[PDB]
């Protein structure tokens, strides 16, 4: 007779940028592009349908960590845009724009592009009674951080208070984090660290930030949408071609009702299956 095989056991090996806008985050994570690492501020205000994370991704700005990291990174991957809108906060007496050589931006000191590291001004650090309202028609994602110094002397030298605090409030949200002082091992030098937390705002609601020290301020917000975007970890090269679904092993033909190459897919694809072969008689 003849036969139909139904399990797509073969991929193209390359990711095809049509019909999906494929954004290759070459040397960074989605978070690095989200935070504003200087070597990936090239991804500023980028939009996508599938972000591709490569294995050699890396970070060069201040050593940090994200509690609930996978939730954050895929929260931005689902809106599919890094559209950042500066909001011009007023930081009275606390010296914005702190940077260091771990994050060398340009000739010297730099910091996260979308983050505002505050210090003391003069020799003080007052408690910040800030406010910023979201009165528009869309939800705001605020990315903010805290500094975990490396010694009690570091805490005093920059945030004169013996113990600092940050409190990012809404009418629905409240998060109060305290910096635990400790000298971590060296990562890109420094023994101090930064931990990243985020605060979504929905329309009408207000975001207020109370802090006696260690605050890593935000500069603005990312406009958030609802769409078909996502992210992918892959080392498959990108070519200009056509395929409607993509796997970490490169694109797939959507010819066959089933597929064997990978469980991870994007778009209208066949359903992942364990089979190695399935021939239907014709």
């Amino acid at each position: 007779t003849n036969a139909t095989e139904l399990v797509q056991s073969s991929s193209t090996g390359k990711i095809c940028n049509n019909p999906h806008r494929i954004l290759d985050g070459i040397d960074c994570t989605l978070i690095d592009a989200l935070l504003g690492d200087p070597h990936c501020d090239v991804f500023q205000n980028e939009t996508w349908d599938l972000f591709v994370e490569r294995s050699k991704a890396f970070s060069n700005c201040y050593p940090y960590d994200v509690p609930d990291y996978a939730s954050l990174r895929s929260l931005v991957a689902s809106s599919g845009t890094l559209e950042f809108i500066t909001e011009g906060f007023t930081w009275t007496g606390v010296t914005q724009n702190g940077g260091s050589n771990a994050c060398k931006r340009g000739p010297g000191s730099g910091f996260f592009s979308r983050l505002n590291w505050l210090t003391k001004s003069g020799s003080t650090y007052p408690v910040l009674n800030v406010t910023m309202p979201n009165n528009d028609n869309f939800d705001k994602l605020y990315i903010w951080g805290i500094h975990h110094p490396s010694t009690d002397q570091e805490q005093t030298s920059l945030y004169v208070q013996a113990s600092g605090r940050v409190t990012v409030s809404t009418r629905r949200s409240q998060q109060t984090i305290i910096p635990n002082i400790g000298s971590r091992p060296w990562v890109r030098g420094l023994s101090s660290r930064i931990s990243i937390y985020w605060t979504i705002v929905k329309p009408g609601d207000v975001l207020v930030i109370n802090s006696n020290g260690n605050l890593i301020a935000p500069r603005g917000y990312f406009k958030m949408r609802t769409g078909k975007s996502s992210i992918m970890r892959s080392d498959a090269p990108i070519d200009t071609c056509i395929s409607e679904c993509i796997t970490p092993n490169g694109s797939i033909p959507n010819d066959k009702p089933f597929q064997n190459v990978n469980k991870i897919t994007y778009g209208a694809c066949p359903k992942y299956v364990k089979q190695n072969t399935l021939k239907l008689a014709t």
Partner: antibody, heavy 122, light 110 residues
């Protein structure tokens, strides 16, 4: 597929000196951070030096301070350690280490070189 | 001070559960010491296995586990294999220093 390959093993007299190189391959830098660690003939492990992208923030084995210097060649992707005024106590096989990965891993000393032998002789 | 210590040698069987340990001389071992475990297979083939108190390196199978049992650091191999016959050193972070233990020789039978 990361690999670190060393060179420069050779015999030296006391107070003498040696320079060592470890050719790094398979990854984007010469190293994200890199460090030198030696194991004595008594098979004890002592960390020697450490580097940033450009050597930020304490990297000193106080027993080798003033005697060694660690360098990296960002262009040719090479790591260097030149030790001078050598002592008996420095006779070891020095290992080329690149400290481990991102937030998820952050394991120090995952990737190592196969080591090259330094003998402070007489 | 800063002298890190561990058992000289251990011996076990495949399928069994092992637990190598690492102690401080500065007192109690905390997460703030960031216990790091590197495995040397012979002819100087080192591999970092566990760092960051429990954090497992990418290629390391889940059978290896690091923990704190009491005031000690520890490395447990639940489901030991002949693959695990090696020498396992340990390193703890004292803020100024950065030190290794003598290393434990693991002798798997079978």
């Amino acid at each position: 597929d990361v690999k670190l390959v060393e060179s420069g093993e050779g015999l030296v007299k006391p107070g003498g000196s040696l320079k060592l190189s470890c050719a790094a391959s398979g990854f984007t830098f010469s190293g994200y951070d890199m460090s030198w660690v030696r194991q004595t003939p008594e098979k004890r492990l002592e960390w020697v030096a450490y580097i940033s992208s450009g050597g930020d923030y304490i990297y000193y084995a106080d027993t080798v301070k003033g005697r060694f210097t660690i360098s990296r060649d960002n262009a040719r992707n090479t790591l260097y350690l030149q030790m001078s005024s050598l002592k008996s106590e420095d006779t070891a096989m020095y290992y080329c280490t690149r400290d481990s990965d991102y937030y998820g891993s952050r394991v120090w000393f995952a990737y190592w070189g196969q080591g090259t032998l330094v003998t402070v002789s007489g | 001070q800063a002298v890190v210590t561990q058992e000289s040698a251990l011996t076990t069987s495949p399928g069994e559960t092992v637990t190598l340990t690492c102690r401080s001389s500065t007192g109690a071992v905390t997460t703030s010491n960031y216990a790091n475990w590197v495995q040397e297979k012979p002819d100087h083939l080192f591999t970092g296995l566990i760092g960051g108190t429990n954090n497992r390196a990418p290629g390391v199978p889940a059978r290896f586990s690091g923990s704190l049992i009491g005031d000690k650091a520890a490395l447990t191999i639940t489901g030991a294999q002949t693959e695990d016959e090696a020498i396992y050193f340990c390193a703890l972070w004292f803020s100024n220093h950065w030190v290794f233990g003598g290393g434990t020789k693991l002798t798997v039978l079978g």
